[PDB]
Write a protein that binds this DNA or RNA. Sequence first.
RNA 1: GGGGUAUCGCCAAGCGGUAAGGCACCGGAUUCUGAUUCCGGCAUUCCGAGGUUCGAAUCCUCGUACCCCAGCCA
Length: 529
Amino acid sequence: TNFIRQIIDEDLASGKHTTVHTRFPPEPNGYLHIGHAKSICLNFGIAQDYKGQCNLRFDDTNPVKEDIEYVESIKNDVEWLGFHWSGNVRYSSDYFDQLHAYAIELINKGLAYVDELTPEQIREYRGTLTQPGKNSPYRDRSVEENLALFEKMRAGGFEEGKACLRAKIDMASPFIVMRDPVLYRIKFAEHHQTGNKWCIYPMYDFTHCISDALEGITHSLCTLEFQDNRRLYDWVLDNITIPVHPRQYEFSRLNLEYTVMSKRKLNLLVTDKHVEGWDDPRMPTISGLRRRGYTAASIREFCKRIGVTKQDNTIEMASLESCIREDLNENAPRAMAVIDPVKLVIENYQGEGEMVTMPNHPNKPEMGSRQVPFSGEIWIDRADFREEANKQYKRLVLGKEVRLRNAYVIKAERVEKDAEGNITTIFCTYDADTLGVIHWVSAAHALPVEIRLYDRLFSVPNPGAADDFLSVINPESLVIKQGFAEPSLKDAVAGKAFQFEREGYFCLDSRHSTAEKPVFNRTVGLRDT
RNA sequence: GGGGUAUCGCCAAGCGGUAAGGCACCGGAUUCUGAUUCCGGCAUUCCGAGGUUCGAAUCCUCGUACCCCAGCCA
Ligand SMILES: Nc1ncnc2c1ncn2[C@@H]1O[C@H](COP(=O)(O)O)[C@@H](O)[C@H]1O
Ligand SMILES: NC(=O)CC[C@H](N)C(=O)O
């Protein structure tokens, strides 16, 4: 429950509505991000909880900023999150003929006129936050003139910016949005849906309310920056001949620490190549999270936890990571992998090796087990061996022993260094029958793996509020290591996550993982206290 | 000017009956993943100051802080 579901409840009770119909209206000018996910969960979630409908609509009213590539990926992300829209995918452009007719209705009613104030003059005439604007000198043309001039605009008889269609409201309204908002502007640009049939395009405020009404939307849900816009939303519908009047309700947008949730900024990271692309695992895009290894279910859980309110908020990264850990901690099978390898030989071991049984998931025997190869030459993480270290250190210490995960106990007794004095091989002995702790991988059966450790994209909590957000990128958002994985991962399937015991959750693909050299992305590290 | 919001570090219930839950955090117990699991603690107070009431975070008054609006962007 949230303030919006309560409003719906009350409309159902009072009989104002007998069904709920919502919509997710993204503009196809970029990929969807976790913020869109909050909106997707809200609109599609309400629809299914109330046995209603939710449309997927591409608000494609500005051709120069959109692309068919985006509409393609957006349908992909919505589907991946686990939601289905009502009927066919809709497009604002599907209503261009309708919008054009409604503009004509307004003109016929003296509520719209063709203005020829230049793009600079319109602002000079607009007024300020504390001073009323003033009437354009072209504001009182006759119905006939506006009609003729509007057709000229439509026909291509005006250069760009040389004319626009404006609503006739109030140049002195405290709501800046009501100061004769522009309904149409000229743009000789091919539209990804209508090609070159139009050279004039409808503005957002004129388009959105009419699209909602025609679609039968009951509750139009948007973010807080459109609160002022609601007044123009209602003005348009109140002044044209349309049978329903969808009501808008705004909620606060999502903000995540250490990241940016702006398409213009996300686009800049992609265009200047500071990330691989929109689906870079460090990106807060739905596709980037998917490639990072998050589950749609964990994103839905997250959206469920953060709530829906009217308060400005900035969720912490810990909250998101908790959601993915909960999912993976329960379902991700375990495996051995050494990210920072150093050789360790068991001079005590005899033979070419043997096989040891390891649980696919400790706390869950129902997930079965597997046979893993053990030998006298294995790999362990350098960080797990210490010649000295204090008393806390529960790992392998020169002269002390530790349990090899699901295997034997070993005692380090003779280390060996190189030129710069860097250890190159730890010599230990093992107990014939012995079956802290550390993971390991048999060197002879090791699968060479590239491991990509990811971290926060930016080094500050609120990069979006920096003078130059790019100058605050975290140089270690991605750190590539070459390690060794148990042969078992040879059959790892892209997308599917695994828990590399004592390290974290990882998954394949990474767009780079091939047959010869597999690449794994660290979805998220384990809680290391 | 106008439109909005102010409850534990970060989210968020509470809609006049005298403060849910989640994340984070501090303890203890389990555990061959210092993970998980598991019990235990964590705002005598809800931006501030008055008012009304038997009684308020929940109503009124005046303040204070922050967010949004001057694209022919959405
Ligand atoms: N950060 C955000 N948090 C929540 N909802 C958002 C966010 N950004 C955009 N939306 C929603 O997503 C819809 C489409 O976004 P856009 O691609 O900007 O048109 C908007 O109408 C909002 O309802
Ligand atoms: N009323 C709406 O939610 C439309 C929002 C608009 N598509 C955007 O860019 O967020």
